[PDB]
PDB file of C-alpha atoms in Angstrom:
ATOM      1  CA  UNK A   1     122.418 177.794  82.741  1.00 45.52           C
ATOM      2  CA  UNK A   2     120.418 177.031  86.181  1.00 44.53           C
ATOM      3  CA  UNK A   3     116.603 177.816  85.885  1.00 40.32           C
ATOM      4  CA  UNK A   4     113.853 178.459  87.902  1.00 39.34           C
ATOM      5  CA  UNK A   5     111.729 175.524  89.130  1.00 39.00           C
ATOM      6  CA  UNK A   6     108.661 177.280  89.652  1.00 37.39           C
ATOM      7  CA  UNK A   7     107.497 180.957  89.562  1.00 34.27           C
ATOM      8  CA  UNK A   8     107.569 183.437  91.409  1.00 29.97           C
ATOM      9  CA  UNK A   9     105.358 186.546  91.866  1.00 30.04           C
ATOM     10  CA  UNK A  10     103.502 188.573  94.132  1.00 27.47           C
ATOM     11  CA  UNK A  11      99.695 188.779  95.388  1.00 28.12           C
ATOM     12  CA  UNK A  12      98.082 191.261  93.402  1.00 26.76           C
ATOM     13  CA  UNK A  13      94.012 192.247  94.426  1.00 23.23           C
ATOM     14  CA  UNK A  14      91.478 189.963  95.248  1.00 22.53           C
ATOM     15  CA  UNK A  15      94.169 186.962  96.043  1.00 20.37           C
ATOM     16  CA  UNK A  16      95.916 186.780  92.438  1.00 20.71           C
ATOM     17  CA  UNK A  17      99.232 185.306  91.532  1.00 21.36           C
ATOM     18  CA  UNK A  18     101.301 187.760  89.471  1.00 23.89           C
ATOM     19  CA  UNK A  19     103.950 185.843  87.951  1.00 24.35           C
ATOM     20  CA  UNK A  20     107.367 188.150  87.442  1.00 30.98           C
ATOM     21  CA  UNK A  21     109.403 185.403  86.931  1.00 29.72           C
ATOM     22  CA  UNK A  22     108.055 182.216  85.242  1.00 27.59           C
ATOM     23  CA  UNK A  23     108.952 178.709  85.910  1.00 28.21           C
ATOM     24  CA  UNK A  24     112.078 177.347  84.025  1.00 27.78           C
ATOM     25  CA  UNK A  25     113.491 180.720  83.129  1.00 25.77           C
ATOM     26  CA  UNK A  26     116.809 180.801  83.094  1.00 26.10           C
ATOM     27  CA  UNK A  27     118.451 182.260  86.511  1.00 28.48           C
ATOM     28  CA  UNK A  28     120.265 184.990  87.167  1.00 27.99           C
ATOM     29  CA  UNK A  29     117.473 186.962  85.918  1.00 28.10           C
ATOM     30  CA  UNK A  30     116.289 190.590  86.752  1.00 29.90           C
ATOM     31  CA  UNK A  31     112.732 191.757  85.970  1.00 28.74           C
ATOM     32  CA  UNK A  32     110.911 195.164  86.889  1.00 29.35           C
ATOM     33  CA  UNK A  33     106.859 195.679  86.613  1.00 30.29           C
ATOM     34  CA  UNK A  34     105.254 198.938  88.166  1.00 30.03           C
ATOM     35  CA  UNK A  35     102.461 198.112  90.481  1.00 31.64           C
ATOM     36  CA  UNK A  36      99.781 200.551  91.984  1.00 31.78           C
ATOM     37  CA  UNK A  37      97.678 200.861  94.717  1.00 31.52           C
ATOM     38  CA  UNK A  38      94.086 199.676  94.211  1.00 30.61           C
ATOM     39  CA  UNK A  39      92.194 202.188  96.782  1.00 30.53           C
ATOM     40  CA  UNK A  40      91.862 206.329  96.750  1.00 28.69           C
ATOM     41  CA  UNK A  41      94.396 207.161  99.459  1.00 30.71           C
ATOM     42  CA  UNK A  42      95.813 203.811 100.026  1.00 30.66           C
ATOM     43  CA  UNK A  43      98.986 204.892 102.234  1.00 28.76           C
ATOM     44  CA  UNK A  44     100.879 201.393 101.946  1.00 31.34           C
ATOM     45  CA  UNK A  45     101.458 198.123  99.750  1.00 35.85           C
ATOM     46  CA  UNK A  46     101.564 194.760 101.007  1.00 32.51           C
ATOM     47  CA  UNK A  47     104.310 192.836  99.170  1.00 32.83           C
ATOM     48  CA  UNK A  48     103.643 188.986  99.537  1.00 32.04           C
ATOM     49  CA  UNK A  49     106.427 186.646  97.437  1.00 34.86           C
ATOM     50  CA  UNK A  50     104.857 183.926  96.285  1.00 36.27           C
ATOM     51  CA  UNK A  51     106.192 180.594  94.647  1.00 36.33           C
ATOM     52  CA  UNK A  52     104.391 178.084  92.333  1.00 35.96           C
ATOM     53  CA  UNK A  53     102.294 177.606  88.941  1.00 37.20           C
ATOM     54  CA  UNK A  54      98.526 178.235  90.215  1.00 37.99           C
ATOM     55  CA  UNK A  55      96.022 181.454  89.551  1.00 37.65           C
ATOM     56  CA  UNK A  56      95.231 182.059  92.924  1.00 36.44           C
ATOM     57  CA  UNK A  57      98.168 182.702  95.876  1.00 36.60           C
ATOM     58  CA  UNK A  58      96.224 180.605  98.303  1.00 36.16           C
ATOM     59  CA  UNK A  59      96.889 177.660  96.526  1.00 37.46           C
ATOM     60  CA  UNK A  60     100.835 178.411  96.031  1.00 38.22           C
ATOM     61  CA  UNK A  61     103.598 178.991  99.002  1.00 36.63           C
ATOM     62  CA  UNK A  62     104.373 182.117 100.730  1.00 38.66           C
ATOM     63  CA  UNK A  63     108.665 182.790 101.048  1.00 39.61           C
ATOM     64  CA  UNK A  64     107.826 186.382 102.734  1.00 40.87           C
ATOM     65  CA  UNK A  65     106.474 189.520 103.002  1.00 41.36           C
ATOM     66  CA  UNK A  66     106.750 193.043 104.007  1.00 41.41           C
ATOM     67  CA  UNK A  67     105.196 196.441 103.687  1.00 41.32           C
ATOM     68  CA  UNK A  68     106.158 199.653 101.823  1.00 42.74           C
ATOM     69  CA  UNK A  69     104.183 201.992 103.982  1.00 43.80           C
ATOM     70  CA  UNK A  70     104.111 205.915 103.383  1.00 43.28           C
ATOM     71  CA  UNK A  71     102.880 206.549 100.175  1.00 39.73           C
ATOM     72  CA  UNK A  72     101.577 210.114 100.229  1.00 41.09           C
ATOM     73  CA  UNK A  73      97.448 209.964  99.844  1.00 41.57           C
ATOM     74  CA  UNK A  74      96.599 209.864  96.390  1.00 41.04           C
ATOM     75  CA  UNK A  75      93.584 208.290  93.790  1.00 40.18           C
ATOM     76  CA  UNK A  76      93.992 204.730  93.253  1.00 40.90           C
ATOM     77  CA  UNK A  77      95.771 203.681  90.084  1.00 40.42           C
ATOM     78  CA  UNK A  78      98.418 206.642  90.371  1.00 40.15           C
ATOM     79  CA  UNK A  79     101.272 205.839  92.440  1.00 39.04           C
ATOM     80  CA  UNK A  80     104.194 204.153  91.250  1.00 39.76           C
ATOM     81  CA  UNK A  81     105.219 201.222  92.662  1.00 38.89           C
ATOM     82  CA  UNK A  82     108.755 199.596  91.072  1.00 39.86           C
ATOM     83  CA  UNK A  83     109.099 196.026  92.184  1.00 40.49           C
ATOM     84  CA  UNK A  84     111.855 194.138  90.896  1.00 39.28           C
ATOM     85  CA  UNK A  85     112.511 190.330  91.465  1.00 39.01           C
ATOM     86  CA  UNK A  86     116.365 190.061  90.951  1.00 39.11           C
ATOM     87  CA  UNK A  87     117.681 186.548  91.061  1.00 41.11           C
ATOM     88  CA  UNK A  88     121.604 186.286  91.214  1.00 45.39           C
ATOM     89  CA  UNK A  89     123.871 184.091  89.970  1.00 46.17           C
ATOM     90  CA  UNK A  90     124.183 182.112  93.367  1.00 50.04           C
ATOM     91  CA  UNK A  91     120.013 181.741  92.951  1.00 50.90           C
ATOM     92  CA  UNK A  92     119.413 184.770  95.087  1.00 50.57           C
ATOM     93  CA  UNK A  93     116.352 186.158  95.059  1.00 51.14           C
ATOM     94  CA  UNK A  94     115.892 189.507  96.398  1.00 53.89           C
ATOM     95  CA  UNK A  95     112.830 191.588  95.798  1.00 54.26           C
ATOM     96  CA  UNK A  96     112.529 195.461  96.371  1.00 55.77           C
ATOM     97  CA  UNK A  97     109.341 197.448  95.950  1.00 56.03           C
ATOM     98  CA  UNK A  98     110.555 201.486  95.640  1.00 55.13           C
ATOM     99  CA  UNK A  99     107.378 204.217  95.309  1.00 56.32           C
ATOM    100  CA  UNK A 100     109.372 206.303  92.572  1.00 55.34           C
ATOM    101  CA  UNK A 101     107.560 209.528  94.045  1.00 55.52           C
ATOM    102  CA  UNK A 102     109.746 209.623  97.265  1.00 56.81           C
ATOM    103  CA  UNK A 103     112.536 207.205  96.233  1.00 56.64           C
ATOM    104  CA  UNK A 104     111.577 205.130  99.534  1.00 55.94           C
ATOM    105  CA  UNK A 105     112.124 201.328  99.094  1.00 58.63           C
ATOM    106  CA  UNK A 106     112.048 198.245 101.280  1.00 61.89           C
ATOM    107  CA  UNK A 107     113.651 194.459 100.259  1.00 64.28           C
ATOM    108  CA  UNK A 108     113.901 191.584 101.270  1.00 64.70           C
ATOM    109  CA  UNK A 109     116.069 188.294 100.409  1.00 62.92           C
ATOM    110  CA  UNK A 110     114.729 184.731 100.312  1.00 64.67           C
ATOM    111  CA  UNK A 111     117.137 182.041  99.992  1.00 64.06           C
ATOM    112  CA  UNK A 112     118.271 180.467  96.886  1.00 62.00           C
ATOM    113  CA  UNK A 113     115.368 176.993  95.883  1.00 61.89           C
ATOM    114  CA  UNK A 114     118.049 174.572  96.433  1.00 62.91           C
ATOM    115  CA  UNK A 115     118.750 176.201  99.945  1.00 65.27           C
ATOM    116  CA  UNK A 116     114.467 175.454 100.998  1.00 64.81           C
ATOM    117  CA  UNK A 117     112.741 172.850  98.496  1.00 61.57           C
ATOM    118  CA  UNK A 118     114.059 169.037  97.490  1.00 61.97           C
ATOM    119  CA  UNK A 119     113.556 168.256  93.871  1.00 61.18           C
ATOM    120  CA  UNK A 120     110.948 165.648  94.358  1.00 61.80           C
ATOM    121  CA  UNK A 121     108.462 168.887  96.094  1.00 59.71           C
ATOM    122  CA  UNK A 122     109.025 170.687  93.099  1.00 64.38           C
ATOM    123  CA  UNK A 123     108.053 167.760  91.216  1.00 67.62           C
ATOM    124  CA  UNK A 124     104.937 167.310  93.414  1.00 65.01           C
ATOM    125  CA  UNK A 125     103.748 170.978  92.846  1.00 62.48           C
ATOM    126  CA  UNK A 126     104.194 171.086  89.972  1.00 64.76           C
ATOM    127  CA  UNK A 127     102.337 168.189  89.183  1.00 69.90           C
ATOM    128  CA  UNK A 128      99.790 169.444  91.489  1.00 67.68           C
ATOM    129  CA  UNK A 129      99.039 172.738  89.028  1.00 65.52           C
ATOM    130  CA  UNK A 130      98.911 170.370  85.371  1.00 66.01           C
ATOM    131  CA  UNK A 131      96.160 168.325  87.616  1.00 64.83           C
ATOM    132  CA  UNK A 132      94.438 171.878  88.403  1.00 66.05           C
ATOM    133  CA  UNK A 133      95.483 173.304  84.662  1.00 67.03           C
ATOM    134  CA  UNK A 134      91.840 173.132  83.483  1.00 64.17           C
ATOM    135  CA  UNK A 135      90.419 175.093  86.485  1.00 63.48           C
ATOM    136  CA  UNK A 136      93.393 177.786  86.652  1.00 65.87           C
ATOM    137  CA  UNK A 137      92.730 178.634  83.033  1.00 66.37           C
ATOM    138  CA  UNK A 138      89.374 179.648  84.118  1.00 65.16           C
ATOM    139  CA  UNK A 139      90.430 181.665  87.024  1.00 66.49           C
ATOM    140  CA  UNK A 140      92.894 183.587  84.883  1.00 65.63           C
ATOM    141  CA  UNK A 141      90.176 184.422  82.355  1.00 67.11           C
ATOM    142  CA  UNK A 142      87.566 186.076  85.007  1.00 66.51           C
ATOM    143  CA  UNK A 143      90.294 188.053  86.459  1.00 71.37           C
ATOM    144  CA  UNK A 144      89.504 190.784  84.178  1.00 69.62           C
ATOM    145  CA  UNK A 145      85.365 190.436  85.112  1.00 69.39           C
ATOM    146  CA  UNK A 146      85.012 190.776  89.207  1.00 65.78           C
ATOM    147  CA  UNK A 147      81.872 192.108  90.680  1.00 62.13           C
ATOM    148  CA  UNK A 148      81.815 194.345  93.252  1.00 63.59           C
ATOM    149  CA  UNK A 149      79.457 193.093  96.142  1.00 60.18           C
ATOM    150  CA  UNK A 150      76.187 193.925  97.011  1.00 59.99           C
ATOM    151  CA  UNK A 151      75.626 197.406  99.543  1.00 56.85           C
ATOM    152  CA  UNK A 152      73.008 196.170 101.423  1.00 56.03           C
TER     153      UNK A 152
ATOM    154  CA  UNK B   1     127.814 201.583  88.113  1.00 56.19           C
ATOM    155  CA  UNK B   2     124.741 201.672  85.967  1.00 53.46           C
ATOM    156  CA  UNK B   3     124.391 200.584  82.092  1.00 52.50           C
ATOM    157  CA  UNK B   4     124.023 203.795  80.322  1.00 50.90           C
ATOM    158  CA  UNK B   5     122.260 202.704  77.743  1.00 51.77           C
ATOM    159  CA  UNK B   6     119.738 199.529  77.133  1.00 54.44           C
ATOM    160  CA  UNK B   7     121.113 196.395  75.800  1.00 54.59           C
ATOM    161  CA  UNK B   8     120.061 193.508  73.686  1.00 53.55           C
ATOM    162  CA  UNK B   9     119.941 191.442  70.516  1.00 50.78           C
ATOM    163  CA  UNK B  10     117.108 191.858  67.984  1.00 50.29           C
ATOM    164  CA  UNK B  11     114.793 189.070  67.503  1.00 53.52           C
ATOM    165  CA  UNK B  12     112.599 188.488  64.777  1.00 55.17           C
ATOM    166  CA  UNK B  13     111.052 191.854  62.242  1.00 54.12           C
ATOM    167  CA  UNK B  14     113.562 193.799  63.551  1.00 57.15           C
ATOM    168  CA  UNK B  15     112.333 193.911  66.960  1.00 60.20           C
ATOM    169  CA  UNK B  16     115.059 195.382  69.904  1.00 62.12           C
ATOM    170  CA  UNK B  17     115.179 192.847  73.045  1.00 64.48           C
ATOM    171  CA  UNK B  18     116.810 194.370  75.777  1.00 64.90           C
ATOM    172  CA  UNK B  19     118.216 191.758  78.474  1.00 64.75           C
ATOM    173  CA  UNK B  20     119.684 194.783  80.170  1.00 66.29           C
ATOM    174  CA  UNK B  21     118.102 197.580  81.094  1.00 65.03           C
ATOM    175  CA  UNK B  22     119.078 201.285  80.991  1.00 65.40           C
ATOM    176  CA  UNK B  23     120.196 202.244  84.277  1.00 66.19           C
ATOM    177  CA  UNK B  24     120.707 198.803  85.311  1.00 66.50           C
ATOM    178  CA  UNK B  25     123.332 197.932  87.801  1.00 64.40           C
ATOM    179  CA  UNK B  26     126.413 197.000  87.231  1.00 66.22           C
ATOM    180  CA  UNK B  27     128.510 194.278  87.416  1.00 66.54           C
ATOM    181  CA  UNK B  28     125.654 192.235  86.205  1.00 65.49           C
ATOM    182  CA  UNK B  29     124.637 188.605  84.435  1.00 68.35           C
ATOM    183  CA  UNK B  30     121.483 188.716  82.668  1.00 65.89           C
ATOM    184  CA  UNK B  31     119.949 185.111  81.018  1.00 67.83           C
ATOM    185  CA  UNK B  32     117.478 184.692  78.822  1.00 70.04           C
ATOM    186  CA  UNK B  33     116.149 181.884  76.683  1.00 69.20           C
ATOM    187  CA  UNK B  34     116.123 182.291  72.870  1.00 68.97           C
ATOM    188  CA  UNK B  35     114.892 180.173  70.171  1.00 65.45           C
ATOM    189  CA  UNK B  36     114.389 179.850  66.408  1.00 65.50           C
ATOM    190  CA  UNK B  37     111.797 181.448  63.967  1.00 63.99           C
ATOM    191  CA  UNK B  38     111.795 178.617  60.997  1.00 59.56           C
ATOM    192  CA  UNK B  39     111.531 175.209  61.261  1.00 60.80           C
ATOM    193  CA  UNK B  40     114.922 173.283  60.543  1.00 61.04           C
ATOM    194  CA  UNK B  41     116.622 176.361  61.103  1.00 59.33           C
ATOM    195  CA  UNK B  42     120.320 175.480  61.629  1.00 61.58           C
ATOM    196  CA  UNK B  43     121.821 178.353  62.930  1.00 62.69           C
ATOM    197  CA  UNK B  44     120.767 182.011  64.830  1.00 63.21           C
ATOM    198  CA  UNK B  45     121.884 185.590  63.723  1.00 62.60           C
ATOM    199  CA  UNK B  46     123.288 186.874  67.292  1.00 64.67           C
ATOM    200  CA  UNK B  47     122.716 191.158  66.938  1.00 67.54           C
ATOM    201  CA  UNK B  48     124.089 193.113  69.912  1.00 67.97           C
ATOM    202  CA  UNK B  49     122.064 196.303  69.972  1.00 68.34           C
ATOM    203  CA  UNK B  50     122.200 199.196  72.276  1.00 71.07           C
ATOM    204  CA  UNK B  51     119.809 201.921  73.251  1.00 72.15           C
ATOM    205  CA  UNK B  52     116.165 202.383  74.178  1.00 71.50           C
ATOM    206  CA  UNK B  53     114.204 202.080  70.756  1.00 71.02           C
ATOM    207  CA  UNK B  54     111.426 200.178  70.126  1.00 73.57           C
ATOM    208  CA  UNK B  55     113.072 199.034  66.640  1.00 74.70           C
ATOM    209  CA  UNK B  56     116.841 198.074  66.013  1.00 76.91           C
ATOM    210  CA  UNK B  57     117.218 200.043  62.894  1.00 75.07           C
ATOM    211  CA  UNK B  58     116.624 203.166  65.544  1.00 73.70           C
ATOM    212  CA  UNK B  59     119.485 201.538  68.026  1.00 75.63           C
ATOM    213  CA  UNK B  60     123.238 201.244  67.470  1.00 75.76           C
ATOM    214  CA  UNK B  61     124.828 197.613  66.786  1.00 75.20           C
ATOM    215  CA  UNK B  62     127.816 197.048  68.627  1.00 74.68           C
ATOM    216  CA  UNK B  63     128.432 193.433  67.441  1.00 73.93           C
ATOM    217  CA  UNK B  64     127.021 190.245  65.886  1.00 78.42           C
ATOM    218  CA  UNK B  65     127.918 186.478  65.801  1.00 79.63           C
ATOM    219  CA  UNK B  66     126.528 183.371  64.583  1.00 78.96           C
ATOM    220  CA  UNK B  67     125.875 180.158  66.128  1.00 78.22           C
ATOM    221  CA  UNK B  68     125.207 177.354  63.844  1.00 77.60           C
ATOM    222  CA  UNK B  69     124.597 173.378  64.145  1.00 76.79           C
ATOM    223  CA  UNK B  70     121.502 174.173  65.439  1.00 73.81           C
ATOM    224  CA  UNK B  71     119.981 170.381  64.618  1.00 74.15           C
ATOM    225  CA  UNK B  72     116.666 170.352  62.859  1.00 73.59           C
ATOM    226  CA  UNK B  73     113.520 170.608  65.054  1.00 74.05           C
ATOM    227  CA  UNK B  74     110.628 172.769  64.569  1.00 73.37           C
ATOM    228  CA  UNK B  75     110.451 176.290  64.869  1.00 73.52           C
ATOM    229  CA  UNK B  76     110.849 177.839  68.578  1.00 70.87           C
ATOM    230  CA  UNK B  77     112.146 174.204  69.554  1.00 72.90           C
ATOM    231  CA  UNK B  78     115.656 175.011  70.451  1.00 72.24           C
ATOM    232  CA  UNK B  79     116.680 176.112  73.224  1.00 70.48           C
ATOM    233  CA  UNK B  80     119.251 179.062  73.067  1.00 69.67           C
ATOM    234  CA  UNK B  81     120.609 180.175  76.454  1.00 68.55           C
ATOM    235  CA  UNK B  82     121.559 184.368  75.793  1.00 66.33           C
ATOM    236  CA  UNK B  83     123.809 185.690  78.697  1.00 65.79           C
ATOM    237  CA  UNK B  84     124.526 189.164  78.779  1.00 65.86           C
ATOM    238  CA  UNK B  85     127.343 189.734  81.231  1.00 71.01           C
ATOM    239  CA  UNK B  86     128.819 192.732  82.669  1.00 68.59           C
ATOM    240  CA  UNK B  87     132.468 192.657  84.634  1.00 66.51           C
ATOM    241  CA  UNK B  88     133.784 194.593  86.908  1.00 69.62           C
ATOM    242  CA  UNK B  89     135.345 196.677  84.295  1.00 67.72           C
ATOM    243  CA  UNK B  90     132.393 197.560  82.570  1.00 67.68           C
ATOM    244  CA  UNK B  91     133.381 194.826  79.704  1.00 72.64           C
ATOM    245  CA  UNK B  92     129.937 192.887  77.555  1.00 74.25           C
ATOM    246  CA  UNK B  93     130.681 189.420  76.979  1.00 77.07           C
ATOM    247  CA  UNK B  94     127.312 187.973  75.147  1.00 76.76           C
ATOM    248  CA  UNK B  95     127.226 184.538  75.043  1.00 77.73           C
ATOM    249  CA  UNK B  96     124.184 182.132  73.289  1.00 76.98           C
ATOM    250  CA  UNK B  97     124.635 178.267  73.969  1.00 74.90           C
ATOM    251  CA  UNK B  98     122.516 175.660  72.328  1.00 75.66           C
ATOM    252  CA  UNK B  99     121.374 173.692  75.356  1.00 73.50           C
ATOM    253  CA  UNK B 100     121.425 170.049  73.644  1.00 72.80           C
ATOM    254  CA  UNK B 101     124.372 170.234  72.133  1.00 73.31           C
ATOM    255  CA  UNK B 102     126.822 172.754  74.286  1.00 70.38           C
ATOM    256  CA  UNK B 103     127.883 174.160  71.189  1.00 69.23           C
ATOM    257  CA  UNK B 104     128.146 178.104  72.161  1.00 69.17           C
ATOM    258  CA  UNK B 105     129.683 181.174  70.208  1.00 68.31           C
ATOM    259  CA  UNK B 106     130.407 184.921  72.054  1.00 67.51           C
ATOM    260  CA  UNK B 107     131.876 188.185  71.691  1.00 67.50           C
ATOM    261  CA  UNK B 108     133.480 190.671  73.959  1.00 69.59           C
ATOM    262  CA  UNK B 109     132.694 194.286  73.475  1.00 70.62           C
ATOM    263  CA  UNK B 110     134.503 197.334  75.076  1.00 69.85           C
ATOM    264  CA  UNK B 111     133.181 198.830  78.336  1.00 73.71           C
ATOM    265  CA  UNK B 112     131.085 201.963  77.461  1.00 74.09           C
ATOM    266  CA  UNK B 113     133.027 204.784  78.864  1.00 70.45           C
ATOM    267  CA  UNK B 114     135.719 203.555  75.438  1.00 71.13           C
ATOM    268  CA  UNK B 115     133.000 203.828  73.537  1.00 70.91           C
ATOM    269  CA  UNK B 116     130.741 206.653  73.802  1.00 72.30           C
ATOM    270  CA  UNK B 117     130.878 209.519  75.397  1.00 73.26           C
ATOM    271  CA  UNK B 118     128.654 210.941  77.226  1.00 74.67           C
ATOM    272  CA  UNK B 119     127.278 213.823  75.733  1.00 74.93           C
ATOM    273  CA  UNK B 120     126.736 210.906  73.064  1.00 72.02           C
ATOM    274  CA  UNK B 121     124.596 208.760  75.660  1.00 72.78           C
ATOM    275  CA  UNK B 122     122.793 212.248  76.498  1.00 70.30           C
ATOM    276  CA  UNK B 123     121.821 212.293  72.424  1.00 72.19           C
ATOM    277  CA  UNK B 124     120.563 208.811  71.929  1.00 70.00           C
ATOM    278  CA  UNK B 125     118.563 209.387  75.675  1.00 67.25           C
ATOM    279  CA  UNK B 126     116.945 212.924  74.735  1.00 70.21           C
ATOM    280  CA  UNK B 127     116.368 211.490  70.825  1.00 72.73           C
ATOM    281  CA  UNK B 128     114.495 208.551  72.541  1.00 72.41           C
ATOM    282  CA  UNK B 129     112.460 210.689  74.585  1.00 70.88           C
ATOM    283  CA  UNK B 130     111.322 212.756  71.511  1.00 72.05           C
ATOM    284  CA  UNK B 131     110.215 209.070  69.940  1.00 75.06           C
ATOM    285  CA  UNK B 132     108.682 207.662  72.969  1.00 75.67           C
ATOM    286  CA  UNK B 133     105.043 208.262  71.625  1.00 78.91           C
ATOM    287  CA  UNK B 134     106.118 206.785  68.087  1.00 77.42           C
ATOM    288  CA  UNK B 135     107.494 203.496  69.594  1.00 75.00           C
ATOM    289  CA  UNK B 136     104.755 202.934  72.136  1.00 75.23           C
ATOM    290  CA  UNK B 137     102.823 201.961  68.898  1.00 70.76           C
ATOM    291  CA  UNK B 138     105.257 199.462  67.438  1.00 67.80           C
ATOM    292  CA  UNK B 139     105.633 198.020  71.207  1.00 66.76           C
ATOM    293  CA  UNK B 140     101.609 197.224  71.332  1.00 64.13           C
ATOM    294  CA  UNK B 141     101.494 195.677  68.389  1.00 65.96           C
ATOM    295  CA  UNK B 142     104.860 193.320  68.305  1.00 65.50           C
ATOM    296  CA  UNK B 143     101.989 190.723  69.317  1.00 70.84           C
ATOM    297  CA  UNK B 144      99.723 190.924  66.373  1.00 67.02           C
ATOM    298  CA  UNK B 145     102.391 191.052  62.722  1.00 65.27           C
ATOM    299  CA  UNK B 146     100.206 189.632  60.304  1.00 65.39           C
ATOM    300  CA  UNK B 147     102.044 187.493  56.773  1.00 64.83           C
ATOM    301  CA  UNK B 148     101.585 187.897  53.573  1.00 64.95           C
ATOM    302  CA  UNK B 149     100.649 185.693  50.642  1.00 64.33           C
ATOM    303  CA  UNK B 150     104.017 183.992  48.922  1.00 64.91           C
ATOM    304  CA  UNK B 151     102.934 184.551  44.877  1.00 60.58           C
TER     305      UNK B 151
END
């Protein structure tokens, strides 16, 4: 079976890579997470795919974005967000993020790899994250410890 | 179409695996990539299970198969590539492949509407429900089995 050269995930808070699918799965593959918001009334998501191996989203490659806006005013933490990264048989991937209150969804499709990346840029990034491996374990450990800032 | 019910193979303590997911979509082809639990192992137990339980022995098998040549390695080594596929006609073929060699076994199993029926799928759905709290438990801690001494 064909497999997934690098991972893919969205931006979670604070400018973290959340794997859904990880690199050399085997494709076609469907997996579902529930996200949430991460503000009291916070009437929209942000969904930003993101492909490659590091901790942080600024140092991996953006295939798109879009927004699930309307999701009725609520404390953060509570609403249900479904997102499911679906990758077909053809390599596929299409990503929908539903809030399961209303039923409302939005999608979008990003071409199979072979269709936007040559082999030997996989290779590169992924030789670029072993090279950072050290300093993305770190990053991955703190996650879990973030201070809010100072009032002033 | 959806799947009525969740599908998968048990893996190792009994544990259900679902590579397709209760009201999942269908037709659908869902990979995954098993492995062995022993070292030298030379073959895999291939357990077809359906239904949303934490534990097999609380699902329903539907099938099972072997695949064997498996050549020695250590354990979790191999690489077994599990598709799940559902046709057009509702039909499961479950397929595992040893990736060095090619060498691959499957079975076909009946759509579900010649199976069950489905006040039946209601049952195993509402029973599931009524365990949800029970399973959660066995879920959280499928991470952390501890061995025993052998003597």
């Amino acid at each position: 079976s064909d497999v997934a050269p690098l991972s893919l995930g969205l931006e979670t808070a604070g400018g973290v890579m959340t794997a859904l699918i990880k690199r050399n799965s085997t494709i076609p593959t469907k997996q579902t997470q529930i996200f949430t918001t991460y503000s009291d009334n916070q009437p929209g998501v942000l969904i930003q795919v993101y492909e490659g191996e590091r901790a942080m989203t600024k140092d991996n490659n953006l295939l798109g974005r879009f927004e699930l806006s309307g999701i009725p005013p609520a404390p953060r933490g509570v609403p249900q967000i479904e997102v499911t990264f679906d990758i077909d048989a053809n390599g596929i991937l299409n990503v929908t993020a539903t809030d399961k209150s209303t039923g409302k969804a939005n999608k979008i499709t990003i071409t199979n790899d072979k269709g936007r990346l040559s082999k030997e840029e996989i290779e590169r990034m992924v030789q670029e994250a072993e090279k950072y491996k050290a300093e993305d374990e770190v990053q991955r450990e703190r996650v879990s410890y973030r201070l809010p800032n100072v009032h002033g």
